[PDB]
Write a protein that binds this ligand. Sequence first.
Ligand code: HEC
Ligand code: HEC
Lengths: 108, 108
Amino acid sequence: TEFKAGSAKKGATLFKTRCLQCHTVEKGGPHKVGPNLHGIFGRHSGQAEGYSYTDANIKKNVLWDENNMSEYLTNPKKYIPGTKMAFGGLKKEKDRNDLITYLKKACE
Amino acid sequence: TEFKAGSAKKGATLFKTRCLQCHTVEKGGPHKVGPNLHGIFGRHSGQAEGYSYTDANIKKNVLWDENNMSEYLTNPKKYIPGTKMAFGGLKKEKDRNDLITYLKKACE
Ligand code: HEC
Ligand code: HEC
């Protein structure tokens, strides 16, 4: 790709410190501020039921792959202008590789 | 995406006339000229076991999503220079949408 595997353990702690405030990853996990992300890989943006997405996310219709996800995480608002996800971004590719490695695994 | 759903039925007949000569889609289907494609979506290129891929496909490490797949099908050799897949391409987006619609479904 333009994405390579990292440390899932490192990625777990990245999740906890940077994403857990708003999201769950487990199957049967609830929506919070943000939507539960189980099964995100391969699904298009805006399709978790019971969550109120912005117009912007839905119409962006991103197919979530480890690769798209990387560009998204760099700068969410640059990627989906108008998203209400209030997260600045993960500028280091190594951080993103770690986190996505952990998401790839925990969201299946 | 930059890909929209079409006719899975139309996509089935596209498969039969243009891809079936070399590939199977069913779970438990054999490799032929080309590899069995069950589960292709979300997997990287070159990872079906028991198939002898070209150096080119493997190192290209494409993550197969309905979207990548479209660009691939336009012109396989332009996309993976050196691939031994001898298929010229499906130039009409509508044809590709139909076929991918059918693959999305039959390869799960
Ligand atoms: C609250 C301050 C957030 C933090 C921190 C993170 N996310 Fe988030 N995310 C949040 C919201 C409110 C939304 C909805 C956006 C909208 O415009 O509707 C999102 C969305 C996602 C998505 C898209 C999900 C989809 O189903 O399309 C993803 C892939 C995502 N968020 C991932 C994620 C990760 C991995 C984070 C840690 C770096 C993270 N988000 C932080 C809110 C919040
Ligand atoms: C024989 C003349 C082919 C026809 C017609 C089609 N494909 Fe093919 N495909 C063929 C080969 C020999 C290979 C291997 C390529 C190599 O360089 O190793 C491929 C590969 C694929 C792939 C990649 C699979 C992977 O696991 O990475 C895909 C996605 C694919 N072929 C799809 C496919 C479709 C949908 C076709 C009909 C339009 C099709 N191929 C035609 C051989 C032949």
